[PDB]
Design a protein around this ligand. Structure first.
Ligand SMILES: Nc1ncnc2c1ncn2[C@@H]1O[C@H](COP(=O)(O)O)[C@@H](O)[C@H]1O
Ligand SMILES: Nc1ncnc2c1ncn2[C@@H]1O[C@H](COP(=O)(O)O)[C@@H](O)[C@H]1O
Ligand SMILES: [Mg+2]
Ligand SMILES: [Mg+2]
Lengths: 362, 362
């Protein structure tokens, strides 16, 4: 069985995903784990792009926009970029930004290969407006940065690549386009697109200024000049990003153990509290610690079955850490922290546990 | 001018909101500040409902669901609840949950009063399934809890109220319904709905089990019994929640100062770094500190104009704290922290600033 089918079956079994209305079929709902993973991915993207950057701001435009907007690109989005292009001047005005600077957005746009190609999906797109003569430079920068982003979130570099669009497959408005591709594992060609980084020149603002009559050019006072900025567009797939991170984290460990090697910042469940048994003495302290940890992270409490099977489930979903409360805990007031990948166990005082986990959960 | 019009004008001026495609009109895009505020509200709701609760899990269902789903409630959502009702059993299975327990979701569903009534909006809904004989109890609980939630995020209690639906205005499937209403400030009746907490009995699961043929009843082993759980539905408006928080935070301060008294956890911009002047010596250290803070929170750097006007803008948008870097900072290596509401200023060492802010930013 292909890796893709295996990962999809695992996702369905552990509630990462459910067939949308099990009772299109390419429409998928995200179960608890799936929702948490998707949100973690979105938050990391937003933090790397918006909150961490002085030159990039955020925006959230309506799915249903005026019909003339898409005539330019009582009847009434296939992408999230046109809202950004239309609110360019509004952002320049309120946020007090000048090129080079970015406007970032995430949102839903409207088959097979599991969730690779779905009718309803979510995109994470940024429009970086720059003075034309720097576009190329900036383009490379982003091409690099975006790529490393995935690596920085745990994707094996060897499963990522850059595909340069040849002049024939380049759009008339696109001067250069470099797509990040991931080795999903499809039949035939196993590589697929994940995020497209395009140099759209000044086509978008020019077109919207012509069709709207509003001058969307920027005026640089430093030089007393006026120009239509060039646009660098990193457009990443949220559904495809989740698919890629999930696929890459999958691993089978002589003994065999299934484990999702999620980067901590992306795991749906950060910590699992596991009383050695259902004993009346262990469970209360365990639930107390679990409540303390829920004050910070999404936690799971499981007192069911042997400790080994519970460890197996928590690794199967990629939980970074497990906290075991044994009978010695009732005496020394310490718990056993088990790190997912290495399975290394270390006994630490309960009143420090949180900090011990914080540093490690990034 | 009504408070509502004033707040809307302020929102448009400072980039909380833009008229969707300025170039329906009741469709609104969220500018940078607006996006950050909306996301903060969503995150607090999710933390209070999902991550902090052992008995509540999350889910994210597709906007476009099978047509029979809405026949029960190639042509193809007005609410986000039907996905939850359809995935009840899937969640019981993957998450290993038993009544009483909740399934929470947030998502877009599809005029005037600014953003109070918009065609495309976002809801935050939770379905709490419980053994029937406890519904009433639980209902009250949630009715209380939800209410306090708003108060805990800074809304003056006196602008919130509970409206009991009389038997005539109760739906056939609803046994009791208590709507939280906020004093928005409309013409005529200034109160409007904000979140509805309904007791839907076992209508939803019964209807979906009849129309789908799949038995969605729960089996309690502790008693060896089988029953259709009763549903408690807190359904809050994300657009209306933002409108309410924004309206309530607005204040005019003898001298007059406009200020948004946002709870820290909801302010779009948590901190503003303000060099006393554009001097070449102050700006570098200021940008260094600003980068350090962007590692944690959304920050704004403003070296434009007099320090007073910059303080005025940062209060006008509700920024909790301002960090001023003066020439003495170059000597003592300390900065002046100005707390929004009180305007109290305290000089603190730079290498501690972050912690000083952390404790206060909750
Ligand atoms: N049908 C789809 N399902 C899931 N993700 C998609 C789909 N179409 C596009 N994407 C993602 O959205 C990104 C930007 O789309 P585009 O602007 O059309 O290149 C792509 O690089 C994909 O990661
Ligand atoms: N047209 C709308 N615009 C903005 N928010 C809405 C709209 N309709 C409903 N809501 C919010 O969604 C919540 C749940 O909707 P409902 O399930 O229809 O009662 C309401 O309590 C409102 O806060
Ligand atoms: Mg920023
Ligand atoms: Mg939870």
């Amino acid at each position: 069985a292909s890796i893709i089918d295996t990962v999809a079956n695992l996702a369905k079994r552990r509630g990462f995903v459910y067939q949308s209305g099990e009772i299109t079929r390419s429409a998928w709902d995200y179960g608890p784990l799936g929702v948490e993973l998707k949100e973690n991915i979105k938050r990391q993207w937003w933090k790397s792009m918006v909150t961490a950057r002085e030159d990039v701001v955020g925006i959230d435009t309506s799915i249903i926009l005026p019909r003339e907007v898409w005539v330019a690109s009582g009847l009434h989005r296939p992408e999230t970029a046109q809202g950004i292009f239309t609110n360019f001047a509004n952002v320049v005005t309120t946020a007090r930004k000048k090129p080079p600077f970015g406007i970032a957005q995430t949102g839903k746009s409207f088959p097979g290969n599991f969730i690779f190609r779905t009718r309803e999906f979510e995109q994470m797109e940024m429009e970086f407006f720059v003075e034309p003569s720097t576009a190329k430079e900036w383009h490379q920068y982003w091409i690099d940065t975006r790529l490393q982003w995935y690596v920085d979130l745990g994707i094996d570099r060897d499963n990522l690549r850059l595909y340069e669009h040849p002049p024939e497959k380049l759009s008339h408005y696109a001067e250069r386009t470099v797509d990040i591709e991931y080795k999903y594992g499809f039949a035939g060609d196993p590589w697929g697109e994940l995020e497209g980084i395009a140099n759209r020149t000044d086509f978008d603002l020019s077109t919207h200024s012509k069709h709207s009559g509003v001058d969307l050019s920027y005026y640089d006072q430093a030089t007393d000049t006026r120009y239509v900025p060039y646009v660098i567009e990193p457009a990443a797939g949220l559904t495809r990003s989740l698919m890629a991170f999930l696929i890459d984290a999958y691993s089978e460990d002589v003994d065999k153990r299934t484990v999702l090697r999620f980067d901590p910042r992306l795991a749906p469940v950060k910590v699992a509290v596991l009383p050695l048994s259902r004993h009346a003495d262990l469970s209360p302290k365990a639930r107390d610690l679990a409540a303390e940890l829920r004050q910070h992270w999404n936690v799971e409490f499981d007192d069911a079955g042997a400790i080994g099977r519970r460890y197996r489930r928590q690794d199967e979903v990629g939980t970074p850490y497990c906290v075991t409360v044994d009978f010695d805990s009732l005496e020394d007031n310490a718990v056993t922290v088990r790190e997912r990948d290495s399975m290394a166990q270390e006994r630490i005082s309960i009143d420090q546990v949180t900090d011990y986990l914080a540093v490690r959960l990034k």
